[model samples]
Target: RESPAEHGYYMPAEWDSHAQTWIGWPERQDNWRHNALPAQRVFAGVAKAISKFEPVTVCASPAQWENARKQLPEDIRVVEMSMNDSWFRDSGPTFIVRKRNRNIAGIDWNFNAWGGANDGCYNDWSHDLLVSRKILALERIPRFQHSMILEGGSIHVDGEGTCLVTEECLLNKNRNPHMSKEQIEEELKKYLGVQSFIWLPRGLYGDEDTNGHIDNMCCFARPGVVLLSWTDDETDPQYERSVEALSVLSNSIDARGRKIQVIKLYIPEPLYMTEEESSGITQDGEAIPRLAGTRLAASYVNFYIANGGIIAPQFGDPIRDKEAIRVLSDTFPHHSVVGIENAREIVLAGGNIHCITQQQPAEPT
Candidate 1:
């Protein structure tokens, strides 16, 4: 198959426009803990919030369809499907829309359950392995397969010609250590159709599950402006990671050769799983354990940009939460800015809102 760029297709920024949002129903207790009951409510809340802006679909297992249907708003559709976990944005297809005519295609990257035989979440991800195919087939779009162990959250694109990634992930031995940085860039350029690449040294210090997904560290608010998760507390362990990424982003230019603008969004106060939060989850021997005091990968950079609004995560930190909303409101003056009151629950489950939802870009008329 031809490269997406060669076919006049490109992965647009999430804010560009969208046909709908896709998500897998939450069920796995190992990830969500306490039978995933708590996380389901949060997921439903997010579904309802985004549905106000655009159509939303929640894919569920046969057993979960009814529950998902009952929990989600009437407007949000729920379809039955079997899956290992609820991280569709990572396991599902990344749609690249053509320049016009509502034409579109998709890229399916290999997911190694996160880190494969290493520290990945589950012992088996056989079902998740097929999520992209199912999604692409459902849309009746052509699909491209990439062998790299890349996740949707690991790379963020500007819809212009620039993409952001991190060395902590794409280059980790668990994913593709043998592939050199140059080769890795070639693959991204060939697939994503980006003209330039910016590589940060790492992501938030505790983002182990995703090995520092770009979504949790930095993202493009627009073609030229990049928003990074930051910290002012130098004594904080995450301080260096934030500083390192800031230095790289501030010094680099995007695909259009424009100096990149970096916006700092303060990271939420550090949060760890309370014994209560951790106790709710049942440990199936195969899935990773959510232990008490396990530092959650909390970041404001993980917000999802909808067609007319930004669905941001709120840690309940009255200060940082409002600050994040204000910064986003100012940055996206035209779009609505809404927050998830219980994003901490989602983070404890391994990823935040962006991890569960996948955007299908609207076709141009």
Candidate 2:
């Protein structure tokens, strides 16, 4: 099968002009507490916030189709697309663009709910396998299907042939253990059209849910610049992780042969699951247990870069929240920054704004 690179298509950066953003409506009482009502409210907020800059689409299950459409703004498109959970960044397609012709395409990598039977978050993710297909068909975009077990969240591209990823998640035995590190790199080069790769040593301290997805820890601000989740407190577990990642970025150069500029985006004061929050979730058999005291992976780096805006998450921490807004504003001076309060609600389920949203890059004109 011909890869997207062979067709002159390459994955664009999230900061690229997006045609629209895709979000799966959260459901599943097993994964989302209190029947997912709280999550639904937040999802609606995220959608509305993004709609200000560009189009937004909320894919709801047939069961919550009516409710979602009613809750969301009319301007935001709500389609009935079934899914096991709401982490669209992992299950949804990774869109690619052909700059020469100004065309777009989607890559459907095999998803196993983060991990298959070996150590998946949920036992059943059959529906998630079709999410990319459905979205591609819905948008009438060309599709390229690959059998590799890769999630969109696990990889980040600079659109200039540089790819940012974490060794913890993509190299985890649960993901694609059969493929060697070099083999995996080759696959990424072919699919993402990347010529350079930076493998961060690990993700955030408490981001085990997605096996420390890179989005939660770091992301590219542009081709040769990045914003990382950082904390000054040396005692905090995240300190060491950030230091190691900083070292990697400091020494490495991008595909464009430019040294990476790293900006520190302070994380919120450590947020943990409250007993009350854990009690609200029903401990079904298939899903992973939402235990009390588990530290939620709260990071400002998880914010989504929209068409002309940056939709960030706020943990209600007055200082850090404002800091996130300030830094993101400074980094991308051209784009307006919007923060969604009560983002803690989504993190309790294992991810934040960036993990729940996927951008479909607009064709360059």
Candidate 3:
């Protein structure tokens, strides 16, 4: 099959105008603790927050359809789209569009619960593996399949062809062990329509949930500008990771051949799971264990880009959280920044705003 890039389509930037936001309802007790009630509330809040900007459609299981409908706002739509988990960014389709011709398509990347038997959080991802095709079919859009074990959170594209990714996820032995860097680059170019690839060494420390997804480490504020999670404390585990990522981004140029402008976003003071919270989760061998004191990878880089603003993850840190919002507000002066105070709940389930959300790019008129 011909790649979308060859057929005149490219994955648009997240900051581009969107048709609507797609989300999967959180109902997996194995993934979220406290019977998923807390997670459901947060998901509803996030959906409501985005609905104010544009349309929001949530996919829930048949069993939870009414529950989700009752909790969500009337303006927001909910449909019975069964899913094994709530990480839609990794499981949902990657939308690509051809503006001049006004055509749209989707890319379905293979997922193996992050690492399959190598180190995957879950043993079975049969339903999650089919989610991309299901969502694309729901959109009634044609889709091209990629064989590589890829996830949406592992990549950030500038819409102009430059993509930011990390070796930790893409190049790890757990995923595509036989695939080389050159081969992976070729795959990204064909699937995501990326030309220039910026490879960061790793993601935030203790970010094993998504195999160091780049969305948690760095992202494009725009075509040639990027926001990197940084900390000044060299003793902190994140300091080296931040420094390494900054160096690569600062030295790299985008697909337009422009030097990347790197802005440092603050890392939230480290967070850990409590014994009570851990007990709230079932000790199912299928999902990753939420041990007490297991440090959660909290960062400001996992914010979502909305139409006229940004929905950033706020950890309720008295100082750095506010600083992150201010810095982002200053960076993207045209777009307002909104912070969600209950973002910690999402992270506890192994993701933040961007991971639970997927943007469907609006087709050109």
Which has the greatest TM-score?
2
Write down the TM-score for model 1. Answer: 0.97
Where does candidate 1 stray beyond 4 Å? 100-102
lDDT of 2 by residue, 114-205 (tens): 77886789998888989999999988999999998898888998878899999998899989889998998998998898888999989888
lDDT of 2 at 332: 86
The per-residue C-alpha lDDT of model 1 at residue 281 equals: 83
Question: Candidate 3, residues 218-286: lDDT per residue as tens digits?
Answer: 999887999998999999889998998888888898889899999899898878988877888877777
RMSD for all candidates, in order, please. 1.4, 1.2, 1.3
| Candidate 1 global CA lDDT score | 0.86
Model 1 lDDT tens row, 172-215: 88888789989988888878888788989887868887788888
The residue-level lDDT of candidate 1 at 332 comes to: 90
Q: After aligning candidate 2 to the native by TM-score, how far in Å is the CA of 272 from where it should be?
A: 0.9
Q: What local distance difference test score does each model get?
A: 0.86, 0.89, 0.86
Clashing residue pairs, backbone N/CA/C < 3 A, model 2? none
Native-to-model Cα distance after best TM-score fit, residue 177 in candidate 1, in Å? 2.5
Query: Which pairs clash (backbone N, Cα, C closer than 3 Å) in model 1?
Result: 33-281, 34-280, 34-281
Could you tell me every candidate's TM-score relative to the true structure? Answer: 0.97, 0.98, 0.97
Worst 10 residues of 1 by lDDT: 97-106
